[PDB]
């Protein structure tokens, strides 16, 4: 997990709520006593919109992208066109808290201290409907049919689109645990509704709920988060915290959660409420964390007036062996794919998955606080029945991880450790420079060769049953990537200047080189043939002859028979070789 600050700004005042245009082109911020309009690309502030008298406690923006609602301490609500003019003013009973447009009908809600004011577009009246309590936060059901309200009294209650109240839940403790934000999960058929478009006055004055599929994220100042159905039933258990949370929030996908608060950061979670990481940490309280439409960007607002725009990068985690691509799905599962039979198996963890490695009959997975060893139960090469062999409850720091027949191999930042299954260390090796790359190159069970590449450009072979590391070669630049041919006679190396170099190992001599490479593999059966990717091309080379070039983006992970296992930005693609051409 990685997050990058794309741009930053600081307002004159505190920032209370955030709205995005549905195409993601503009960001609107309820800062102090004005609305601020921002470009999401680079944070240029286009205009301070002037209409309100007092504190703009929130803003929200309708799914058609024509109109947005903003609410004030001066009791007003204003409906702004996307032409940035405030065509229909309104004036509520007291100060506004949260406002929220309906996903389907564009019907608005506007919450206040006792009273919540529903209306549907350009009708002549508003349902100023009454509440037991201060109405802190509001969210429409994903199909648009219920508005759910959270109360300072520690109750969540569910109201239909007409304003009748249908369901209640109390957090045990009541007003001890104020509900400061709630959110319905976006994950249903309606998310593509309004995803197909290419197009100042005053306004005066439900059964079988267990079969309704929606799920509600609740963040309460008892310092707990929990998920709930429209039936009022709690899902699982309260995911405890050590802070006052705010603005529990989701990406467009409905699968990852953002969680801001008095932890002064934006924490990231699964839809099961398991922690996955940390978006940028902050000088002051976080009030707001809004994911950008259609994309992995995030925007944050804090008590000190800082706005921060982050890109989340979600790196790739995988390993291949000969023909078994194992890779990270969600951020908690490994999908292991038999590339000949096209079978898949899912193994579910209960944490983040940080590292994966695979070898004949052995799979290994590293989580934040344990490492898992998995075993195929049969010697059948078509088997997929992985069982957990052993589970090492120990925390590790690593740069790289690999697995062998009886051992886990850990690369710490200049040091290689061999650990038994069951965690007892066997042997260790100390390099003359920082390790940049490692691969297992096969062997008999328990004497396996490892192939190692260093930042100084030295290349080593290390046998897991031996205390001394064997120099194969040294190079003028760092090893970026590294592979051995089917017989173990030949080496391919990527030199960290984006070139591939190819060597004889038995004589320690360069055969040939190529001026554009990023990843490389030998054909696993047909020696004297290899493949690499670089600069937007796939490149197949046979036996010192010219190289076949065709357009591709993605990277070569392996090469078997007539197929090259290229990896696209999320999934394996299995390109086929023109055998007729090298022939």
């Amino acid at each position: 997990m990685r997050a990058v600050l794309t741009w930053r700004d600081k307002a004159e005042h505190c920032i209370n709520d955030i709205a995005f245009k549905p195409d993601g082109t503009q960001l609107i911020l309820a800062a102090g006593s004005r609305l601020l309009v921002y470009d999401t690309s680079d944070g240029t502030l286009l205009q301070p919109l002037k209409g309100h008298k007092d504190t703009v406690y929130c803003v929200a923006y309708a799914k058609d992208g024509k109109r947005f609602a903003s609410g004030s301490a001066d009791k007003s609500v204003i409906i702004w066109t996307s032409k940035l003019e405030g065509i229909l003013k309104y004036t509520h009973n007291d100060a506004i808290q949260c406002v929220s447009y309906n996903p389907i009908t564009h019907q608005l809600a506007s919450c206040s201290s006792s009273d919540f004011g529903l209306w549907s577009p350009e009708q002549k009246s508003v349902s100023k409907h009454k509440s037991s309590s201060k109405i802190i936060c509001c969210s429409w059901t994903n199909d648009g049919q219920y508005l759910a309200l959270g109360m300072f009294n520690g109750i969540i209650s569910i109201r239909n689109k007409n304003g009748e109240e249908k369901v209640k839940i109390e957090r045990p403790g009541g007003s001890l645990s104020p509900i400061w934000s709630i959110c319905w999960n976006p994950s249903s058929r309606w998310e593509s509704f309004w995803m197909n478009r290419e197009n100042x006055x005053x306004x005066x004055x439900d059964d079988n709920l267990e079969e309704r599929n929606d799920i509600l994220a609740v963040a309460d100042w008892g310092q707990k988060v929990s998920f709930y159905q429209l039936s009022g039933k709690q899902i699982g258990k309260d995911r405890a915290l050590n802070f006052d949370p705010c603005c529990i929030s989701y990406f467009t996908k409905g699968e990852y959660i953002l969680l801001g608060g008095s932890d002064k950061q934006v924490s990231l979670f699964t839809k099961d409420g398991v922690r996955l990481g940390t978006v940028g940490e902050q000088n002051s309280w976080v009030w707001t964390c809004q994911a950008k439409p259609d994309s992995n960007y995030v925007v944050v607002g804090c008590q000190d007036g800082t706005i921060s725009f982050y890109q989340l990068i979600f790196s790739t985690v995988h390993g291949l062996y000969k023909d078994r691509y194992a890779y990270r799905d969600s951020m908690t599962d490994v999908i292991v794919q038999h590339l000949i039979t096209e079978q898949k198996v899912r193994i579910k963890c209960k944490e983040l998955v940080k590292k994966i490695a695979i070898y004949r009959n052995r799979l290994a997975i590293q989580l934040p606080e344990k490492i898992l060893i998995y075993e195929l139960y049969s010697e059948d090469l078509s088997d997929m029945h992985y069982r957990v062999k052993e589970k090492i409850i120990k925390k590790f720091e690593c740069n790289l991880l690999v697995v062998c027949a009886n051992h886990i191999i850990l690369c710490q930042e200049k040091r290689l450790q061999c650990l038994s299954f069951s965690g007892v260390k066997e042997r260790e090796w100390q390099m003359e420079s920082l390790i940049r790359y490692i691969k297992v190159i096969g062997g008999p069970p328990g004497r396996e060769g490892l192939l190692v590449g260093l930042k100084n450009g030295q290349i080593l072979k290390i046998f897991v049953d031996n205390l001394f590391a064997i120099v194969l070669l040294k190079q003028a630049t760092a090893v970026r990537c590294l592979d051995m041919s089917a017989s173990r006679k030949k080496l391919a190396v990527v030199d960290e200047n984006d070139t591939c170099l190819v060597y004889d190992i038995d004589t320690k001599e360069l055969l040939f080189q190529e001026p554009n490479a990023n990843s490389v593999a030998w054909n696993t059966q047909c020696e004297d043939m290899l493949c690499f990717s670089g600069g937007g091309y796939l490149n197949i080379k046979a036996s010192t002859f010219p190289v076949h070039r065709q357009k591709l983006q993605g990277f070569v992970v392996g090469y078997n028979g007539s197929k090259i296992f290229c990896l696209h930005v999320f999934s394996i693609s299995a390109v086929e070789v023109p055998q007729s051409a090298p022939m």
Partner: protein
């Protein structure tokens, strides 16, 4: 013998201190003895002059702690008299010889709160909170309460968490500071 507060022990202590002071009229540890024994004996007017006597002298590194103690005890007696200006002078003179003194700041923060300077009181209470290693929950309360009155409700709630962290079940703070700061937070 003073610290027992048993009257015969405190009178014996006063007598040894006055005997030493009669042999050595500038002996600060004995003069602080006289003042402290007289305070325990409720002879506060006799303590007052025997501290003024010390307060006129130049400081030195050997008597430094008894100087710093004597100025603080005299500053307390000046707060009983309500002539806070001489207490503030003694507290600041104490800090000029030793900037670490938590009791010099804690008395000064109380004067700033009496003067309705809730911000400067919060500055003194922040030093006293910090240099208590957050083990003074009474300053914890005062710091949160002064942030509440300064219209700094988030900062008040920060400290109400830090007090409950420092001491679970600590009385008063949850209802009065924490829930009134929460109740203001969106008005």
């Amino acid at each position: 013998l003073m610290a027992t507060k048993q009257k015969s022990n405190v009178e014996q202590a006063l007598n040894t201190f006055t005997e030493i002071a009669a042999s050595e009229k500038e002996h600060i540890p004995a003069l602080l003895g006289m003042a402290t024994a007289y305070m325990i004996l409720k002879q506060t007017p006799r303590a007052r002059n025997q501290l003024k006597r010390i307060a006129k002298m130049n400081w030195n590194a050997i008597d430094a702690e008894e100087f710093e103690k004597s100025w603080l005890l005299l500053a307390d007696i000046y707060i009983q008299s309500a002539k806070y200006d001489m207490a503030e002078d003694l507290l600041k003179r104490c800090l000029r010889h030793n900037r670490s003194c938590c009791k010099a700041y804690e008395y000064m923060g109380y004067i700033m709160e009496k003067e309705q300077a809730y911000t400067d009181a919060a500055l003194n209470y922040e030093m006293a909170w910090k240099y208590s290693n957050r083990t003074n929950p009474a300053v914890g309360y005062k710091l949160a309460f002064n942030y509440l009155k300064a219209k700094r409700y988030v900062d008040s709630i920060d400290i109400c968490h830090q007090v409950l962290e420092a001491h679970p079940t600590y009385p008063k703070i949850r209802k009065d500071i924490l829930d009134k700061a929460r109740a203001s937070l969106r008005p």
